[PDB]
Amino acid sequence: SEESQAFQRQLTALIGYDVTDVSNVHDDELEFTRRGLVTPRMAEVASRDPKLYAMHPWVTSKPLPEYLWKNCIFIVIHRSTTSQTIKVSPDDTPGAISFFTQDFVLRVCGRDEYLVGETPIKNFQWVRHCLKNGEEIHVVLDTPPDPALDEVRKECDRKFRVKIRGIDIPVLTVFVEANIQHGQQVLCQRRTSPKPFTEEVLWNVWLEFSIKIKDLPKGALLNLQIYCVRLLYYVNLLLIDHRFLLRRGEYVLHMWQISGNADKLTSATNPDKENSMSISILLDNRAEMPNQLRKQLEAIIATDPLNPLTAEDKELLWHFRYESLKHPKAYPKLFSSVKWGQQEIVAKTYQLLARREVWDQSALDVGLTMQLLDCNFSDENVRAIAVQKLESLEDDDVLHYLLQLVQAVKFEPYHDSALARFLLKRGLRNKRIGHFLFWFLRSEIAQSRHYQQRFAVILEAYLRGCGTAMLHDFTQQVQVIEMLQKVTLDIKSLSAEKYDVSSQVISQLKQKLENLQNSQLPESFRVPYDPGLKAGALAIEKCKVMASKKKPLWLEFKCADPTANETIGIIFKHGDDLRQDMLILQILRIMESIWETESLDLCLLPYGCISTGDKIGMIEIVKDATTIAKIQQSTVGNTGAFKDEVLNHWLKEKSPTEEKFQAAVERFVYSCAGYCVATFVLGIGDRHNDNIMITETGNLFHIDFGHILGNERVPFVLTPDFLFVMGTSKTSPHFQKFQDICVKAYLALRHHTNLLIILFSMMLMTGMPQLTSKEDIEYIRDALTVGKNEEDAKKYFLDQIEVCRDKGWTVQFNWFLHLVL
Ligand SMILES: CC(=O)Nc1cn2cc(-c3cnc(N)c(C(F)(F)F)c3)ccc2n1
C-alpha cells in the first residue's frame, strides 16, 4: 500500500537504521525474526487494558520502609481555582478517594504521572518520593486520556569439516584459526598452515575436526580468526541455523578488526564492505550421597559466580546431578559441568530440565536468573528457564533491570529469543518500560554495528504496537535531539582545542538557539531521562556553553504543563559514549534498592542520563548544586590546602536556619557514606574534586563516570574537608554515625554478592571494551571480600576509611598537579 510505504519511512527515522535492507546478510534470520515477533506483538497488544495503558499507574508492591513510615497523610486536590487539603489514610484507593462527600481522574501537578487504579496511595512511587524529600503531595482533578489515541495501525555420523578458499584485503605472515564454540567453551579447534600476508592469500584447505555432525549442539559458533603472534580479524557463523538445519554452501563473510567483550561473540558480519577483510568458506556436511561427598558439592554450590570449577568439581556435579537439582543456586554450576560437545550428555540434561519442579517453585533470585543469561550459556532451553523466572517480576522491578536485560540480549545466540520476546511483551504492556526500551535500543543501534541489526528488529516490533500516541511522541522527541546534536557540533568547530570558552561563541550559540526556535522544535517535548516531565520553550538567556574540554551545552527549558515556575535543565554532551555512565547510574539505583530491603537510605543521587545517539546524549541538571573543587576555589588560592574549614563554611552560608543546617550536615553524612561504599565496590573511588558535587541541602553526589572508568592511590574520596563537616580534626557524634552507616551499608551489599558480581561482569562485557580482562572482573570479589567473616570484612572497610584519613589531601594535590601538567 501507499500508506504502508510512509509508515516504514516514519519507523526508520525513529529507529536510526533501515530494517528492510538485505545487503549485510547471508541468511534470512532477521526477516524470519521480523515475522516471528508479529505474533507476540499482537498477543500483548490485544491483551493489555486500554484505559490503564493510557494512564500507566507507577505502583510498587514493596513495603514502606521504617525511615519513610515516620497514620493519616494529607494531599491537595486542584480544579478550576479550588485548593483544598484532604486527610487520606495510607491504605486508600484513588477511586475511593471522599471528594463528593464519576469519570474524572487524579493527575500529578506538572507531570503526566497518574494516581489511578485499584492500589493504595502508600504503594504509589510518586507518594513515596514526596515522603523521601519531604515535599507536599499536589494533585489535579483532570479528565482521563482517551485510549483511542493509543490505537495501533492494523496490517550424519561423520566428523565435521570446513573448506577454506582464502582471504582478501583491500589494502608479514598470516593464518586462519577455526574454533567451534558453545558458551565461550571451545569444543574443538584447527588452524591453517601460515602463508605470507598479501592482498589475496589462498589455501584450499579442508579443516577436519574431531566432533561428529550429530554431536553439534544448537547454538554452536564457527569462530574464524586471522592471526599475526596476535589476533587481527574475527567473524562468527552459526553451525546450526534458526530452522534447526545445518549450514551448507559458500559464504563470503566480512570480518571485524581488533583495537588494542560481547562484541567478539556477534553473529553479524562487518557492514563496511569497501574497507573490511573478507573470508570465503565452503560447507558440505537413587540411593543418594555419602556425608563427605554431600559436604563436597554443598561447598561447590556455596562458592561465588567467579570461582572457577575444576574437572574434579564438574565430574562430581554431573554424577550427582539429581541431588544438585534440589539446589537452585547450583543450576549455573551444574549447566557449566555439561559436556555440550556430546549429543547423549545434552539429551540427559534435557530430561533433567523436564524435572524442573523445585526450580519452578523457587522464590525468584535475579542474581541467579541473570547468571544463566551471560556469555557462558549458549543453550536455548537453559536460558529459557531463566526468562521463565523473570515473568514474576512486577513492572517496577523490570525497570530496575531493563538496561542490564537489554544488554543481556548480546549473549543470545539467535536473533529471535525468549528474552527478546519478553522485553517486547513487558515494553508493550507498560508505557514507562516501553519509553526506556526505545532509548536503550536506539543507543545501541546508533553506536554498535555488531548488534544494530538484531536490536532494530526488536525496536521496530515494539513501535509497531506501542500506539500512535507514543509514536507521534517519539517523533517530536527524536526531532529535538537531532536539532540540538546539530547545534552542539557547530559550536565544537569554533570551540577549542585550547583553552577556554569564547565571549563571541556564547552569543553565536544564543543566535543559533534563537534561529532554531522560530521553525523546527515542536511547542513541547517529553524529557527522555524523565518521561513524566514535558519540557516546552527554551530560556535562551539562561543557555550557555560549559567551560568543560568537550564543550557541553547547558540548556534551560520552561515546563510545558501549566499545573507546575523553576526551569528544566539539560546538559548536552558530544565526544563520549554515555552508555558507560548509564550503567554505573543503574547499578547505583540497584544498590539503593539493596539498601531498601535492609531498611537503609544512603541518599545517593543517580541523576538522569540517556545516550540518545552516536557519542552524544543528555544529562539532568541537579538544581542548587555545585562542585567540591569550586568551593575550595571560592574562598582561596591557586591550588593545594584546600583549607579543612571551607566545606562547612559553604554549608553554613547556603542554609539560613540552624534546623536547615543540622539537616544539611545530616544529609551529608549519609550521602558521603553511600558514595564511599558504592565507588569502592565498583572500583571508581579515586576521583578528582571537580567530579564530586554537593547540593545547598548538603546532598553529595559523584558525576562524569565515563571519564574515570574510561581510563599514590586512595580507595574513595574522603578528604579532611568532608571530615571537618563531621566534626573530626579524633572522633565526633556525627563521625561515629558515618562509620556506623559505612559498615552497615557495606555488609548489606555483601548479602547480595552474587547479584553484584554478575551485574558488574555483564557491565564490563557489554558497556566498556578495554577493561574486558579476567584480571579486571575479579576486582569485585576482593572489594566484596568473598569468603571472609562479617566482623572480619567490617574491619577491612574500616581500614580503608583509615587509609583516607592517613592520606590527607596528598592524592587531591597530586590529582590537581596532574590535570595541570
Ligand atoms: C546546578 C548545577 O550545576 N547542577 C548540576 C551540574 N551537573 C553536572 C552533571 C554532569 C554529569 N556527567 C557529565 N559527564 C557532565 C559533563 F557535563 F559532561 F561534564 C556533567 C550532573 C549533574 C549536575 N547537576
Give the CATH number, domain containing residue 752: 1.10.1070.11
Nearest one of 531, 619, 593 to 759, comparing CA atoms? 593
Q: How far is the CA of 571 from the centre of ligand 1 (A)?
A: 7
- Residue among 693, 697, 819 to mutate when testing ligand 1 (max atoms within 8 A of CB): 693
Shared domain check, 509 and 422: no
Which is it for the CA torsion 497, 498, 504, 505, positive or negative? Answer: positive
CB 333 within 8 A of CB 174: no
Smallest CA-to-CA distance from 579 within 540, 543, 609, 542 is with: 609
Are 693 and 722 spatial neighbours (Cβ–Cβ below 8 Å)?
no
Do 601 and 635 belong to one domain? no
Q: Treating both helix axes as pointing N-terminal to C-terminal, what angle do 2-15 and 468-494 enclose, rounded to 10 degrees?
A: 50
Atom of ligand 1 nearest to the CA of 625: 1
- Residue 100 in grid coordinates: 463528593
Please name the residue ranges forming H helices in 694-773: 705-709, 720-726, 733-749, 753-766
b/e 201-222 (16+ beta carbons within 10 angstroms → b): bebebebebebeeebbbbbbbb
Q: How far is the CA of 675 from the centre of ligand 1 (A)?
A: 16
Are residues 804 and 689 both part of a single domain?
Answer: yes
Whether 634 and 673 map to the same domain: the answer is: yes
Closest ligand 1 atom to Cα of 571: 17
What are the cell numbers at 763? 557491565
Best residue among 704, 705, 708 to mutate for probing ligand 1's pocket (most ligand atoms within 8 Å of CB) is 704
CA distance 247 to 237: 9
Annotated binding site for ATP: 569-578, 604-612, 701-709
Q: Whose CA is nearest to atom 13 of ligand 1?
A: 704
Q: Which residues contact 514 (CB under 8 A, 6 or more apart)?
A: 540
Nearest to 226 by CA among 183, 167, 186, 287: 167
* Alpha carbon nearest to ligand 1 atom 7, residue: 621
Q: Tell me the CA–centroid distance for residue 553 and ligand 1, in Å.
A: 10
Within 10 Å of residue 44's Cβ, how many Cβ atoms?
A: 16
The CA-atom distances, in angstroms, between 274 and each of 171, 226, 252 are: 10, 18, 14
Shared-domain flag, residues 45 and 70? yes
By three-state DSSP, how is residue 735 classified?
Answer: helix
The reply to whether 818 falls in a domain is no
Q: Name the residue among 509, 502, 578 with its Cα closest to residue 543.
A: 509
Residues having CB within 6 Å of any atom of ligand 1: 546, 548, 552, 571, 573, 607, 619, 621-623, 625, 703-704
Return d(Cα 351, Cα 358) in angstroms, integer: 15
Domain boundary among 411, 441, 467: 467
Residue 456 sits in the same domain as residue 559: no
Instruction: Give me ligand 1 centre to Cα 485, in Å.
Output: 18
Residue keyed to cell 562430581:
316
* Phi/psi of residue 819, nearest 5 degrees: -75, 10
241 Cα: distance to centroid of ligand 1 (angstroms): 47
* CA nearest neighbour of 338 among 373, 303, 365, 377: 377
478 Cα to the center of ligand 1, angstroms = 22
* Residue of 547, 550, 699 whose CA lies nearest to 617: 550
CA 546 to CA 63: how far, in whole Å?
42
Q: What is the dihedral of CA 154, 21, 267, 613, to 10 degrees?
A: -80
Count CA atoms closer than 13 A to 661's CA, side-chain side.
14
Is residue 176 a part of any domain in this protein? Answer: yes
Cis peptide before 99 (omega within 30 of 0): no
User: Which of the 8 DSSP states describes residue 392?
Assistant: T
Partner residues linked to 111 by β-bridges: 533
Distance CA 688, CA 820 (A): 12
Distance CA 523, CA 758 (A): 44
Helix, strand, or coil here: 726? helix
Residue 821 domain flag = no
Single out the residue of 775, 777, 752 nearest to residue 762, CA to CA: 777
Where residue 521 sits, what CATH number does that domain have?
3.30.1010.10
In this structure, the chain runs to a length of 821
Atom of ligand 1 nearest to the CA of 707: 14
Residue 632: all three cell numbers together: 575550595
Distance in angstroms (rounded) separating the CA atoms of residues 218 and 180:
12
Q: 621 CA to middle of ligand 1, Å?
A: 6
Method for this entry:
X-ray
**Domain with 458 in it: what CATH number?**
1.25.40.70
Rg (alpha carbons) of the chain, rounded to whole number: 29
Asked if residue 819 belongs to a domain, the reply is no
Find all residues with CB under 8 Å of 256, minimum gap 6, and list them: 233, 234, 235, 263, 266, 270, 276, 450
| Residue 349 sits in the same domain as residue 320 | yes
| Integer Cα distance of 546 and 573 in angstroms | 10
Beta-ladder partners of 238: 221
Please give the C-alpha separations between residue 81 and each of 71, 99, 115, 517, in angstroms, as whole numbers: 29, 16, 21, 32
525496536: which residue's cell?
A: 459
* Nearest residue by C-alpha to atom 9 in ligand 1: 703
Tell me if 820 is assigned to some domain: no
For the packed helices 579-597 and 395-407, what is the interaxial angle rounded to 10 degrees?
140
Does 780 map to a domain?
Answer: yes
Q: Pick from 467, 496, 521: which residue ends a domain?
A: 467
| Residue to mutate, 551, 703, 819, ligand 1, most ligand atoms under 8 Å from C-beta | 703
157 DSSP 8-state letter: -
Q: How many domains does the chain have?
A: 5
- DSSP string across 580-593: HHHHHHHHHHHHHH
Q: Whose CA is nearest to atom 8 of ligand 1?
A: 621
- Count the Cβ atoms, other than its own, within 10 Å of residue 444: 24
State how far the Cα of 173 lies from the Cα of 190, in Å rounded to an integer. 18
Specified resolution (Å): 3.2
Residues 13, 127: one domain?
yes
Q: At what angle do helices 380-390 and 343-354 cross, to 10 degrees?
A: 20
Closest C-alpha to 749, from 763, 760, 738: 760
Residues 612 and 518 in one domain: yes
Mutate to test the pocket of ligand 1, among 579, 604, 610, 621 (most ligand atoms within 8 A of CB): 621
Task: For residue 189, give the DSSP letter.
Answer: E
- Residue 631 makes CB contacts below 8 A (sequence gap 6+) with 646, 647, 650, 694, 721
Give the whole-angstrom CA distance, residue 700 versus residue 411. Answer: 36
Q: How far apart are CA 555 and CA 557, in angstroms?
A: 7
Cα–ligand 1 centroid distance for 262 (angstroms):
30
Instruction: Decide which of 589, 608, 623 is a domain's last residue.
Output: 623
Name the residue with the closest Cα to ligand 1, atom 16. 704
Q: Are residues 649 and 553 part of one domain?
A: no
- 495: in domain: yes
Residues 182 and 64 in one domain: no
Distance (Å, whole) CA 314 – CA 325: 14
Distance (Å) of CA 669 to CA 181, 698, 699, 740 = 50, 9, 9, 10
Cell matching residue 726: 563531621
Residue 738 is assigned to a structural domain of this protein:
yes
Q: Are residues 585 and 732 in the same domain?
A: no
In angstroms, the CA 215 to CA 543 distance is 64
Binding-site sequence positions = 569-578, 604-612, 701-709
Distance between CA atoms of residues 590 and 755, nearest Å? 10
Question: What distance in Å separates the CA atoms of residue 642 and residue 636, rounded to the nearest whole number?
Answer: 8
Q: Which domain holds residue 606?
A: 468-623
Alpha helices in 560-620 (DSSP H): 579-597
Which residues are within 8 A (CB) of 558 and not within 5 positions of it... i.e. 6 or more apart? 535, 536, 537, 538, 539, 567, 568
Q: How far is the centre of ligand 1, averaged over its atoms, from the C-alpha of 594 (Å)?
A: 26
Burial class (CB in 10 A: 0-12, 13-18, 19+), 235: buried
Q: Are strands 138-142 and 73-79 parallel, antiparallel or unpaired?
A: parallel
Contact call for residues 120 and 151 (beta carbons, < 8 A): no
Considering only CA atoms, which residue is closest to atom 15 of ligand 1?
A: 704
Q: What is the dihedral of CA 236, 242, 247, 250, to 10 degrees?
A: -70
| DSSP sequence for 626-641 | EEHHHHHHHHS-SSS-
Task: Look at the block and give the residue holding cell 575436526.
Answer: 209
Q: Give the Cα separation of 226 and 177 in Å (integer).
A: 7
